[PDB]
Amino acid sequence: WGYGKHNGPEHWHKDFPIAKGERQSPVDIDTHTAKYDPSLKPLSVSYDQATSLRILNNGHAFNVEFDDSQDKAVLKGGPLDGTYRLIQFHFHWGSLDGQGSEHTVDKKKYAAELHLVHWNTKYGDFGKAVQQPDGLAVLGIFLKVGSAKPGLQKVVDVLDSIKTKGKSADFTNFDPRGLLPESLDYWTYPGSLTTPPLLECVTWIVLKEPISVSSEQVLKFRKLNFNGEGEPEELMVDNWRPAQPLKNRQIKASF
Ligand SMILES: [Hg+2]
Ligand SMILES: [Zn+2]
DSSP: OSHHHHHHHHHHHOOGGGSSSSSSSSSSSTTSSSSTTTOOOOOOETTTTTOOOEEEEOOOSSSEEOOOOSSSSSETTTTTOSSSEEEEEEEEESSSTTOOOEEEETTOOSSSSEEEEEEEEGGHHHHHHSSSSSEEEEEEEEEESSSOOOOGGGHHHGGGGGGTTTEEEEEOOGGGGGGSOOOOOOEEEEEEOSTTTSSSOEEEESSSSSEOOOHHHHHHHHTBBOOOOOOOBBBOOOOOOOOOOOOHHHHHHHH
């Protein structure tokens, strides 16, 4: 699987039949239909004690991995039940600034989308969490192009080191708090992961407020390679999945 013409999102169903399941993601957030829900608690992000380990190029995006051996970086509150531990963060971006995000807002597409992945700590590990309806929690943040994001520059600067598929680089003392918008206002719905295996185990929390990144920071994402070192060069761009049918599901708003 990939994002090309022959192995793109339209082909995933052949190997991952859940592709046309009942709670697939991403989706379009119709803000006039989203339901203001008063029973939604504020989001609670405890990330001061986070421990980054490394960054990888897995062939479909780059991953920043965290130590999830202990309750170091956790998300709670909101529509969530229990504590979810941060395991990794990654992005989805486009070849141009008018596309890149996965979720859309009133059909509006953003330059990129940041996903913070967390697993429910009553299931013990990541692998068990993906076997449950409430196993994961992904915090989604949209990236628009404007002014630079001081907080994202360290990520940007090590991209050169993991240009191709399989590369990895030590990447300690990175604070994810530098990627959060000011407001924690969100929309939430029951979904799935956006890349195969597309396991419908996720509780989405899409932040209303976008972060701005500069043109040159986004430009560096686009210099990555899907391909392995020594193979023809295929730029890592447009690694996003098209919006799926909401199919009965209701999108709730915390504001
Ligand atoms: Hg699941
Ligand atoms: Zn993602």
